[PDB]
Design an enzyme around this catalytic site. Structure first.
Site, short mmCIF file in Angstrom:
data_model
loop_
_atom_site.label_atom_id
_atom_site.label_comp_id
_atom_site.label_asym_id
_atom_site.label_seq_id
_atom_site.Cartn_x
_atom_site.Cartn_y
_atom_site.Cartn_z
N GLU A 114 0.86 -1.18 0.00
CA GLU A 114 0.00 0.00 0.00
C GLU A 114 0.90 1.23 0.00
O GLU A 114 1.48 1.58 1.02
CB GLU A 114 -0.93 0.00 1.20
N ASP B 207 -6.08 8.64 9.41
CA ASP B 207 -4.79 8.06 9.77
C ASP B 207 -4.50 8.26 11.26
O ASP B 207 -4.83 9.29 11.84
CB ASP B 207 -3.68 8.68 8.93
#
Ligand SMILES: Cc1cc(F)c(-c2ccc([C@H]3[C@H](C#N)N[C@H]3CF)cc2)c(F)c1
Ligand SMILES: Cc1cc(F)c(-c2ccc([C@H]3[C@H](C#N)N[C@H]3CF)cc2)c(F)c1
Ligand SMILES: C=C(NCc1c(COP(=O)(O)O)cnc(C)c1O)C(=O)O
Ligand SMILES: C=C(NCc1c(COP(=O)(O)O)cnc(C)c1O)C(=O)O
Ligand SMILES: [Cs+]
Ligand SMILES: [Cs+]
Ligand SMILES: [Cs+]
Ligand SMILES: [Cs+]
Ligand SMILES: [Cs+]
EC number: 4.2.1.20
Lengths: 399, 248, 404, 249
Positions: free
Chosen positions: B50, B61
């Site tokens: 990723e 995040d």
């Protein structure tokens, strides 16, 4: 109505303003709020509680006042001030909060979170949460806690917990980021009382609906006092709640000019501004597709303004739709221009405005010179300047 | 005909294991070091990479990744650095997808970004802040340029929305988050055969083993960033340990 | 039409007898301008064009009428009585002071005065005066006690932004009574061009009556609102009492309603037994102070006892003469409220109703809570929320440990 | 009958001079020192002594007198100490009137204070904050106890109020206040023959001679306090110079 988005929250069809640019983790509560608002907006029990609080608690209707001592400073035009500064808590934010706080209770939510920049939305949210017996947490940028310290202590006195956000530019957009992270984690019991006409659907529409009372009153009052519809209606534009609230009742009146004034900081050529429409571009930010200050890769450019309430790099999507349609024009007002209008409003009318609202007063003076003598210009005076007295006294050297 | 990542989960299903999916943000601690670390992941046994696009306001995040992307943006990372990192992974025999927020794609152009991502060897796009309800341009770009579209599901996802999100996904479905992770995978497997990746703040070899018992893929990110922060050898050792936990 | 004359004093300003409360205990040097203001007010009080000018500012500029809110979440702390808040805190500048200032500033323009002086303790009347002087193009000089400039610093800067000169008074107790003395000295020397915009229902005739007439609008509105919302006249109307402007303003419309109790609450500071208080009716005695004959705190020789209160607006050892008359006649009861009682009510209003009151108004809220327990379940009590507590936020935050 | 201060002004007008009226506050710097200084005024040629009652809020007192009365009040000065000063002045062959704000008189009792003042040898009362409109009780005690009543007139006094103030006065009229002072004296004499005292911030012999031209009495107060602060001999010197200024030949 003729100006509402589709069921997905999109304004203007193919252009795609608005929508829901959020993670799937928020969709259950976002759809939950959307359904609850559609159910309660037509409930007479709900509408009765809202009108009653706006009347006996918030102090509506706010008056419309012709600032005759400003006329000579505005090309002999007629400046009418929509006195939202006289509302309870001292700004237009109480309108949107009373609706959303009542809705939070109708949904069974036991916790209310909100962002705040100038502190007025935080004080309003804390005010309604104290009235309704709801837990309240307000996220506020660390720079905003310093320059709006009066509202921090007002929130704590009202029983609200204040969390200083120190990430990013430590201003409004950073408080919104943290409140979003909170909502994601506590969605099943927490209501997010969003403070401006942005965000994902249904918030741009719902906030505007709770602020429509401003323009509806203004449209009746201006005809009663002046005998006709105004030549122009103006307001300052951060996220867009107080502007869209007074603009909306005049959208279908084709002779009424609509002008929104955004913060230009040190000047639009300086990179220290918040002029979203003047220097930004379309993009997805904070749950909506609208205009924002972004660089060539789509990273959010941080905004700067002497006013904490307009120090925001984005703007609500319905404003992006109205700009595309050419119905509303958006002009920049600098820090210096706003502070001149601040002092001028103090010495001419004895009204100490919020530095946010001073931007609208500054642009009204310039619009008055354009339109000329006898022109009627309604100005949304969004808030009073108790929170800004220290900043303004330092600006004029009164210490 | 089939998904781009399909043959990778078939090769893991025959070898009786789950796929190891590794996340690393472009430009941390700098662009060359991040590309060297992403190549190290392929060597150390990562089935899928990723490649993260650092965003200025990453709402989804965590603190380890957010501070890493903040440092990368301070260092001047650009979106084109990600495409350059994908090409280096595909040249090194790896299989890379791009995980980004949607505004950098809108700024780049959805069709232009899909085309250039495919030309770099990229296999798909993970969109944490793009739900299918807004993915009209992306659905069309995913078809024309033959890219997998990895959407995210959540524990709070309603049944109607979970079915619509899975029906719209190609390659695998990102199940993001007690007993919630296997319960969320079970709800996806009850409506589709599409592989399911699980991100759960994986730290140890044992945690990757628990997830490999029900999930088709195990997603690791924050621990890899923490490993790279200590040193490049620490990343290899951790990636090796994680490469063993998925085979159990 | 215009209001009545049933409770007015005589031509000399005396309540209840030609040598009773009120009068003019002033030097001869002030009598020329005092008679001029008296003649100007007698003329304009019956002028429809004057009352139209005042009503126009009260509606479009000040935001009247102020609402009457039933604070349902206070009921349990007031013996299940029903507390109704006359929301003067929502007026422009944030207190009732703007009602009186608009009338007197309009009058000052009618008289051709170009300079306006005023005293202030809490800073609310000073801001109101500075606000009207900016609105009407008048030069403004405000006298404020040095201690008050420190604990109400927010209003000091607001007055300066409005263009007024703020003078810190260092004589005496550095509070309201001392700002009044300095404003008096200014008027004696500048009676030719200067109007004295007095901030409370006291002083020499005609100021007790004129201030009361400009605050009458509070009680007039509340008497209508309470009958509409509760269906009957209230069981009581309460307000805090400094000099007495906000109390007399809401009391007056109910004077001839014999079933409506009237209770004014005065600042008791640390306690009436400590000598650090401002309980004029509880601990004072009749005397001639600040131009009128009324109650005041005075020692055996007649020297003024300095007052103390956490509220800068109630930190005054005197009181208006009409309140002395209404007390001697037995129409109004006056009770003390301590600092601790007021700050408890301050925090309770914040917690329960989301209203941050002025520490002055918190005294009236604290007294209403006690009165509610005294009257019991279902009793209707109207409270004059005279102002908002933005000026007191720093003091209140320190009291409740939100600083350190 | 005639006013208590009548003979004094009759005697001064016979000697081609004005009466020297000196003010000192009781208790400054303390009670014994103030009594000593008031006696020195009698010995130094003061025809009338204004015995001042320190008040906590003296709106009419200048900064020099305000600080002195504050100091006297800190020292615990009492209203009865003012009556003792009148006794000591009467014993020394002086002529004392009391200047006071009205509230200490009300607290004492208007009748009782007039009774005790006349008993102590007092001749009158100067009431700077009591106007004739409110002097009903005082006018009664003034006639009963044979005390003069000195009201004040100002340059701004209307013709109606100046005439009514002069009519109400016994002894002399205080002309409190440039040509404003002689014009104010001229207005009082156009309606009455009562003596007129003039206060004008006098501090030198020259100014005392200027006022003696048109006025029946010269009133000095602030300069006496400032001189007393320096010392008792300085007060004796200044009073002597003022006693020379009030004389013309
Ligand atoms: C009422 C309301 C609700 C919201 F969820 C948000 C919101 C949505 C997304 C984000 C994240 C997004 C992701 N992931 N990228 C960040 C910045 F856009 C932040 C805030 C908001 F601004 C207002
Ligand atoms: C509107 C208004 C007008 C006033 F003249 C006064 C006033 C009157 C007298 C004094 C002086 C008095 C003397 N000399 N002793 C001091 C204290 F009383 C001070 C102030 C006031 F308080 C309000
Ligand atoms: C941000 C908030 N203030 C914005 C604000 C604005 C701009 O917000 P709009 O959403 O653009 O109306 C205007 N006027 C006042 C008085 C304000 O306080 C806040 O209080 O958090
Ligand atoms: C003394 C001053 N105000 C007193 C005051 C009072 C007491 O004033 P009254 O004259 O007793 O009404 C009550 N409420 C508020 C909000 C006040 O500010 C002043 O601001 O000059
Ligand atoms: Cs609470
Ligand atoms: Cs903006
Ligand atoms: Cs109103
Ligand atoms: Cs009092
Ligand atoms: Cs404390």
């Amino acid at each position: 109505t003729s100006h509402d988005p589709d069921s997905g929250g999109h304004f203007g069809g193919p252009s795609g303003w608005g929508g829901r640019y959020v993670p799937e983790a928020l969709m259950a509560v976002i759809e939950e709020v959307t359904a609850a608002y559609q159910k309660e907006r037509v409930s007479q029990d709900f509408l009765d509680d809202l009108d009653r609080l706006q009347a006996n608690y918030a102090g509506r209707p706010s008056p419309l006042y012709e600032a005759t001592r400003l006329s000579q400073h505005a090309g002999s035009a007629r400046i009418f001030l929509k006195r939202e500064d006289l509302n309870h808590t001292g700004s237009h934010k109480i309108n949107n909060v009373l609706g959303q706080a009542l809705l939070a209770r109708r949904m069974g939510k036991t916790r209310v979170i909100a962002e705040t920049g100038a502190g007025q939305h935080g004080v309003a949210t804390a005010t309604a949460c104290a009235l309704l017996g709801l837990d309240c947490v307000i996220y506020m940028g660390g720079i905003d806690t310093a320059r709006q310290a009066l509202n921090v202590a007002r929130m704590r006195l009202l029983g609200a917990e204040v969390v200083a956000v120190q990430t990013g530019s430590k201003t409004l957009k950073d408080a919104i980021n943290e409140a979003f992270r909170d909502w994601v984690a506590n969605a099943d019991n927490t209501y997010y009382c969003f403070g401006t006409a942005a965000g994902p659907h249904p918030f741009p529409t719902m906030v505007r609906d709770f602020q429509r009372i401003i323009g509806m009153e203004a449209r009746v009052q201006i005809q009663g006092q002046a005998g006709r519809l105004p030549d122009a209606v103006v307001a300052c534009v951060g996220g867009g709640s107080n502007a869209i609230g007074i603009f909306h009742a005049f959208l279908d009146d084709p002779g009424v000019r609509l002008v929104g004034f955004e913060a230009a900081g040190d000047g639009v050529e300086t990179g220290r501004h918040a002029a979203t429409f003047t220097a930004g571009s379309p993009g997805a930010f904070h749950g909506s597709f609208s205009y924002l200050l972004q660089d060539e890769d789509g990273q959010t450019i941080e905004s700067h303004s002497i006013s904490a309430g307009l120090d925001y790099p984005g703007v609500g999507p319905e404003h992006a739709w109205l700009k595309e349609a050419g119905r509303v024009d958006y002009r920049p007002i600098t820090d210096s221009e706003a502070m001149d209008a601040f002092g001028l409003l103090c010495r001419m009318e004895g009204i100490i405005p919020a530095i946010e609202s001073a931007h609208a007063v500054a642009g009204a003076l310039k619009l008055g010179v354009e339109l000329g003598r006898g022109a009627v210009i309604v100005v949304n005076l969004s808030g009073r300047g108790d929170k800004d007295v220290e900043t303004a006294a330092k600006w004029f050297g009164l210490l | 005909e089939a998904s781009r990542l399909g043959p990778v989960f078939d090769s893991c299903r025959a070898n009786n294991r789950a796929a190891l999916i590794g996340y690393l943000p472009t430009g941390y601690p700098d662009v060359p070091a991040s590309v060297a670390a992403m190549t190290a992941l392929v060597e150390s046994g990562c089935d899928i990479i990723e490649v993260g696009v650092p965003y200025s306001d990453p709402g989804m995040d965590g603190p380890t990744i957010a501070r890493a992307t903040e440092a990368a943006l301070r260092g001047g990372v650009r979106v084109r650095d990600t495409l350059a990192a994908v090409e280096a992974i595909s040249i090194a025999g790896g299989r890379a997808v791009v995980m980004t927020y949607w505004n950098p794609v809108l700024r780049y152009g959805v069709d232009a970004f899909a085309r250039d991502l495919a030309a770099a060897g990229g296999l798909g796009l993970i969109t944490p802040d793009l739900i299918p309800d807004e993915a009209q341009q992306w659905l069309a770009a995913s078809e024309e340029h033959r890219l997998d579209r990895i959407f995210l599901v959540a524990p709070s996802s309603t049944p109607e929305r979970l079915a619509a999100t899975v029906e719209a996904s190609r390659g695998f479905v990102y199940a993001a988050s007690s007993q919630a992770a296997p319960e969320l995978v079970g709800r996806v497997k009850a409506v589709s055969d599409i592989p399911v990746g699980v991100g759960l703040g994986v730290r140890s070899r044992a945690q990757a083993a628990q997830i490999a018992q029900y999930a088709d893929g195990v997603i690791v990110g924050s621990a890899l960033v923490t490993a790279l922060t200590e040193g490049l050898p620490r990343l290899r050792a951790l990636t090796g340990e994680l490469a063993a936990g998925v085979r159990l």
